[PDB]
């Protein structure tokens, strides 16, 4: 059987993106720039905080000093951090808490393989820290998804080869990173986005230990 599950965070454990979105939206609103909506957040998701601020300024063709840029960056941070103080166990996606308990009940290693630089804080807020054997630090990998580095690092952080692991992901580039690591990917979403050659569940309630074991045995 698989010895570890490498968990992406955003779109698997919880909706982490909503908070960054709401922070940029509030900042834009505050300084009188229109256009940052859910669709436009596409442009901001997975993107540097500073590239993100610049794209927002370009919606209104505004230029600013370095000090005003710094001020606006800080404001978005303040916004973001205030909002994530309200994250709780109620923000855990369905199935995930029971999955984590079952994986620990079954002695399988659990690691985080998230691009979130606030993963530890977010797991603490969700009361999940205790389930995790390791958190792969996205600041310590040279390449983001779709490069495999973060899944390799997560597997290694629990003393396993990626070939002994399942990866769970909601993103196409994440699925690619899992594949290229050696680990076995199981997606949440749809094949149109994730690919036609992996097992995909429609939502996280389907991620059960029973289901992962069956997928492992069938692959
Ligand atoms: Mg994700």
d(CA 105, CA 82): 35
Domain that holds residue 47: 16-85
Contact 198, 186 (CB under 8 A): yes
Going from the Cα of 171 to the center of ligand 1, the distance in angstroms, rounded, reads 5
Flag whether 8 is marked binding: yes
Q: What is the 3-state secondary structure (H, E, C) of the chain?
A: CCCEEEECCECCCECCHHHHHHHHHHHHHHHCCCCCCHHHHHHHCCCCHHHHHHHHHHHCCCCCCHHHHHHHHHHHHHHHHHHHCCCCHHHCCCCHHHHHHHHHHCCCEEEECCCCCCHHHHHHHCCCHHHCCEECCHHHCCCCCCCCHHHHHHHHHCCCCHHHEEEEECCHHHHHHHHHHCCEEEEECCHHHHCCCCEEECCHHHCCHHHHHHHHHHC
Going from the Cα of 68 to the center of ligand 1, the distance in angstroms, rounded, reads 32
Angle, vertex CA 112, rays to CA 104 and CA 122, nearest 5: 100
d(CA 178, CA 186): 9
Contact 37, 149 (CB under 8 A): no
Flag whether 65 is marked binding: no
User: What are the C-alpha distances in Å from 167 to residues 64, 78, 125, 176?
Assistant: 43, 33, 23, 10
Whose tokens are 């859910």? That residue is: 38
User: What are the residue numbers of the active site?
Assistant: 8, 10
d(CA 90, CA 55): 33
Q: Mark the residues whose beta carbon lies below 5 A from ion ligand 1.
A: 8, 10-11, 170-171
User: What are the C-alpha distances in Å from 69 to residues 13, 61, 64, 208?
Assistant: 33, 14, 6, 46
Flag whether 104 is marked binding: no
User: What are phi and psi for residue 66, nearest 5 degrees?
Assistant: -65, -40
Going from the Cα of 152 to the center of ligand 1, the distance in angstroms, rounded, reads 16
Going from the Cα of 36 to the center of ligand 1, the distance in angstroms, rounded, reads 21
Contacts 24+ apart (CB under 8 A), 157-160: 157/111, 157/133, 158/4, 158/109, 158/110, 158/111, 158/133, 158/134, 159/109, 160/3, 160/4, 160/109
Flag whether 49 is marked binding: yes
Going from the Cα of 62 to the center of ligand 1, the distance in angstroms, rounded, reads 32
Flag whether 170 is marked binding: yes
Whichever domain contains 46, its CATH number is 1.10.150.240
Experimental method: X-ray
Cα Rg, the chain, nearest whole Å = 18
d(CA 20, CA 189): 21
State both tokens at 46.
């997975």
d(CA 145, CA 169): 11
């Amino acid at each position: 059987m698989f010895k570890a599950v490498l968990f992406d965070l955003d779109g698997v454990i919880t909706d982490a993106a909503e908070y960054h979105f709401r922070a940029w939206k509030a900042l834009a609103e505050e300084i009188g720039i229109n256009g940052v909506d859910r669709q436009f957040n596409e442009q901001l998701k997975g993107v540097s905080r500073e590239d993100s601020l610049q794209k927002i300024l370009d919606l209104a063709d505004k230029k600013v000093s370095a000090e005003e840029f710094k001020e606006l960056a800080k404001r978005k941070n303040d916004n973001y951090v205030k909002m994530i103080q309200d994250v709780s166990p109620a923000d855990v996606y369905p199935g995930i808490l029971q999955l984590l308990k079952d994986l620990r009940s079954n002695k399988i290693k659990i690691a985080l393989a998230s691009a979130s630089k606030n993963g530890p804080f977010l797991l603490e807020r969700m009361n999940l820290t205790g389930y995790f054997d390791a958190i792969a630090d996205p600041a310590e990998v040279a390449a983001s998804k779709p490069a495999p580095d973060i899944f390799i690092a997560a597997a290694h952080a629990v003393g396993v080869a990626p070939s002994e692991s399942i990866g769970l992901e909601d993103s196409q580039a994440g699925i690619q990173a899992i594949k290229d690591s050696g680990a076995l990917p199981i997606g949440v979403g749809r094949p149109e986005d994730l690919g036609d050659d992996i097992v995909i569940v429609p939502d996280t309630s389907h991620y059960t230990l029973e289901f992962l074991k069956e997928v492992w045995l069938q692959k």
